[PDB]
Design a protein around this ligand. Sequence first.
Ligand SMILES: Nc1ncnc2[nH]c(C#CCOC[C@H]3O[C@@H](n4cnc5c(N)ncnc54)[C@H](O)[C@@H]3O)nc12
Ligand SMILES: Nc1ncnc2[nH]c(C#CCOC[C@H]3O[C@@H](n4cnc5c(N)ncnc54)[C@H](O)[C@@H]3O)nc12
Ligand SMILES: Nc1ncnc2[nH]c(C#CCOC[C@H]3O[C@@H](n4cnc5c(N)ncnc54)[C@H](O)[C@@H]3O)nc12
Ligand SMILES: Nc1ncnc2[nH]c(C#CCOC[C@H]3O[C@@H](n4cnc5c(N)ncnc54)[C@H](O)[C@@H]3O)nc12
Lengths: 258, 258, 258, 258
Amino acid sequence: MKYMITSKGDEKSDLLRLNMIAGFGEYDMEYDDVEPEIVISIGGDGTFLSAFHQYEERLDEIAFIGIHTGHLGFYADWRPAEADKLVKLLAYQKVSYPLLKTTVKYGKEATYLALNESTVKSSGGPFVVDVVINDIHFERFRGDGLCMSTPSGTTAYNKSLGGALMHPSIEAMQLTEMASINNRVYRTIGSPLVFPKHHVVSLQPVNDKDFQISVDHLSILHRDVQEIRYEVSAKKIHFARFRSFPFWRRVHDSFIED
Amino acid sequence: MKYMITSKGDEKSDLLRLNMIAGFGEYDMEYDDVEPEIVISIGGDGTFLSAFHQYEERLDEIAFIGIHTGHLGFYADWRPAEADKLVKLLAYQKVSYPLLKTTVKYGKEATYLALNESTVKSSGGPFVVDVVINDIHFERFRGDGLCMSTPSGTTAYNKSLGGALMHPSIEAMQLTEMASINNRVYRTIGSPLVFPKHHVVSLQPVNDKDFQISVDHLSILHRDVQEIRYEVSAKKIHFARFRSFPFWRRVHDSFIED
Amino acid sequence: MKYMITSKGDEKSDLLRLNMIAGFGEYDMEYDDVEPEIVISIGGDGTFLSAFHQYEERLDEIAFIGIHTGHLGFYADWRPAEADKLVKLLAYQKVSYPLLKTTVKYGKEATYLALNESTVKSSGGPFVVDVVINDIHFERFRGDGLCMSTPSGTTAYNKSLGGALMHPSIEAMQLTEMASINNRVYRTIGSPLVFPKHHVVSLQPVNDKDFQISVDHLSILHRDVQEIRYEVSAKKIHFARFRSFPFWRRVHDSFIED
Amino acid sequence: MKYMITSKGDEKSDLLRLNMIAGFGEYDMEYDDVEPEIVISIGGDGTFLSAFHQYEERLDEIAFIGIHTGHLGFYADWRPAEADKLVKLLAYQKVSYPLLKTTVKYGKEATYLALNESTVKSSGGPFVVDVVINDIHFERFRGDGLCMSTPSGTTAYNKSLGGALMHPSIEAMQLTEMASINNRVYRTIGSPLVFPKHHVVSLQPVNDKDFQISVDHLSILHRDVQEIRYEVSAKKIHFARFRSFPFWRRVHDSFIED
Ligand SMILES: Nc1ncnc2[nH]c(C#CCOC[C@H]3O[C@@H](n4cnc5c(N)ncnc54)[C@H](O)[C@@H]3O)nc12
Ligand SMILES: Nc1ncnc2[nH]c(C#CCOC[C@H]3O[C@@H](n4cnc5c(N)ncnc54)[C@H](O)[C@@H]3O)nc12
Ligand SMILES: Nc1ncnc2[nH]c(C#CCOC[C@H]3O[C@@H](n4cnc5c(N)ncnc54)[C@H](O)[C@@H]3O)nc12
Ligand SMILES: Nc1ncnc2[nH]c(C#CCOC[C@H]3O[C@@H](n4cnc5c(N)ncnc54)[C@H](O)[C@@H]3O)nc12
């Protein structure tokens, strides 16, 4: 079975990567980073996020595996001391988490796929957008920006914005506000919004048409923006599962105690 | 077709009720409040909540209809001026919203069904419970109480507690905190938690075993409490639908502008 | 110099109390709990709160001292291992913290003095009050209740309600909301309000006239309530200071790390 | 008495400015924008903010006056229909609001004066700073940024960040967080912090030394930053007062109803 391994780049991650490859050499496993069937990420959630977008065009043939070189992450689910036990079993069950689709239309169009969330901010100055939910005008937002998050991404940026922690078995997307201006004239919903499948959220500019759009770790300035469209993607990221590590248990170890 | 009508009790609600009955007398409609197939509530969301628990034991044979005597509610979806148009069509499609099941075990057991939310508070003094998610200990909560809400109930008590507005097509339940004590020794998740189907949340007492449990509008003191169990119910409330009134549009008219 | 010592009541607090008394017997110190000049509290912040209201009628002749039997409190500023060092020095400087005055008028009048905060809730059912700031109607509050807090009490109940941590050298009082109902028809300020000296906040009933008013740890039902009046008191609690323990350092050790 | 008038630049603001000048021509009033004693701003709070920093070097000889061309602002306190009544009286009492001092030290030093607030953000990538309160390390902040606000500025950016509304008679400054990263390893206070006079808050870089610092409406990138120092300034902005317009009344008309 084809596979590949990404490393955080430090001394501990590179050495653990070469030992797993040496262990895989004792089996019928071929290292191929062009079309692998198992992608192993060694580092942090950002290392896993980089490995996700590195193979986002081949998501239905790949089962991802995360190993945290430092503290426990949400996508990294294996301590470095449990690595030799992995390559053995890797020679299991597959669970799937929802993904967020982001479409940007200018005056072509660009689609994006996010594992954590997608964020829109102002290219300097004020940020004003008309929030449109299923072609119905819902509100005109004024503030710093908005954040549409995946279920697994609710524990990341979505959590710091007052959002709710959502179990990754629910196919949905959550929208949160960033310091919304609310007075007598300007009115936002304030509460986070959770959208089911096939529901389309559209952001439309009022005056400024340039926005600093971010998709997971990446963030690029988009000029002449006509519409930013959010919707739950039909693609799902597949994880390679070898035991029981519940999401709530994983939430407990990251924010409560471990 | 059998039917019945509940009234808020004021002068405007009673007169509108008698006119609909008089209109139903011009059709093949029999008024029966023992086993109706269409339950019409005229008043507010509390009037609809009272009509729900009045017929919670016959939920799969009944399609509910709400008419707001005052401001627009979330379960009341018809202005009084559109009442004659209702009895005509009532002689349509049925949509279903999820419901929350609450089990209370003492030292028998009592089950409850909530349309909005279920809340646990302390019978005087401090409130401490061990939150258990799927038999795994998640946290020990200290504060004023907790609130497990239905999707349609997210716009009610859940919204005022910082919770997220959840679309009623998603079968889930949301838990929120009420002034959680968080210091160096006491640690809660803080963020609201959204649980899918078949996920069981269990509250367990630490010292005090008496709690003021509320299920929608009702609130009764329970003594010698051993476990409070929350889970998405297999029963669903059925609404009688005659046109398009989206949930987000309904949210817009209630909190943004109308 | 006259003095007295209060104990939490457990085994560790009582033994430490008798050793300090034995140590005070080696000096010119007289134990008198009727009119002491130094009040020592051994236990927690609640033990100190009980010792405060035990001598709230003689606040300008007394310097309070706190010793935490368990974890560090905000009013308890001495570990039990530093007790012998206290009675020696106690045979120093005095700092003063602001206090909150609460006046309740019925259909007489009752005044109260709070070290942490004062809270108003509904005697069952809904809670609605008209908030009046300096005889001007500011808002009509709907929800669970309100909380007027002292500067030193901002780290207690005020903190869990989203309030701001206020330095105890500022003579002010902070008001916070408890799950305020906010829609298109009902509108609260939402943000916490910080009132200077001589500013009077008045709560007035709309329909229900019975409220569960709490002043620090105590909470009693008041019937036939006409007005609840909040204002910064002219009385100040005096602490006996023997070294430097800044408030922000004290905040750091309680919520960040210690 | 010398005076000058600033205009928002639109058609309504310029015409009202020329009519007041024509009215001032009927009195012993000299228009001088180099060293005026009365500065009149016609437009919005941003127009007043621009007029403040236009004369921030002569703050003790000037009494500011605000006229809102559109909706009511917090610094604009006069409707355009009450303009002729102003120039008459302007030929009164002076109230003073606190100001925030911001010192930036590099590897010289730059001081700033803010009427609303001062904000620090990351020059791309992550934002990490060590918060130091009176030379004591209080926390290491991770997130989007921080916001130190003046009392009168608490209703602006500070309000949207969950901060508390502070009366402008209290000489203090309030600090708020912007989506703080809080897990098991990273810990912030979360609650807003209110600092009295002579208290110094210092932000220190950890890795990145470039920050996008903003002082009221202005925002400029600062490179090679060694320390960002916040403290309540000894300078106070003086307002020209002709009647009673309480701050809480002014808060009521802006966020509740008007
Ligand atoms: N899924 C997860 N659960 C718990 N922790 C996690 N860390 C990560 C990660 C990572 C790698 O870098 C890119 C990430 O920077 C995050 N981020 C930016 N600003 C903030 C903030 N102010 N507060 C929390 N996050 C923030 C985005 O969300 C994006 O994901 N993912 C998760
Ligand atoms: N679904 C809905 N969406 C928008 N508004 C609604 N009102 C109602 C109603 C009703 C009838 O009385 C019982 C209700 O009192 C609510 N409640 C208590 N305390 C609060 C609070 N502090 N903040 C918001 N609610 C509160 C409970 O939630 C329960 O439902 N239902 C909805
Ligand atoms: N000053 C302080 N700083 C940091 N911790 C402190 N603990 C105490 C104490 C004590 C003794 O019992 C009475 C106290 O119960 C508190 N309380 C009630 N409900 C909550 C809640 N939901 N969240 C935080 N507090 C709460 C009140 O505020 C009151 O003071 N004082 C402080
Ligand atoms: N004092 C006031 N009270 C009530 N409203 C006010 N508007 C103003 C003004 C103005 C002119 O432009 C610069 C201002 O942009 C504000 N700002 C940026 N981002 C936000 C946000 N996300 N939420 C609220 N504000 C924001 C800053 O605070 C700064 O002041 N001042 C006030």
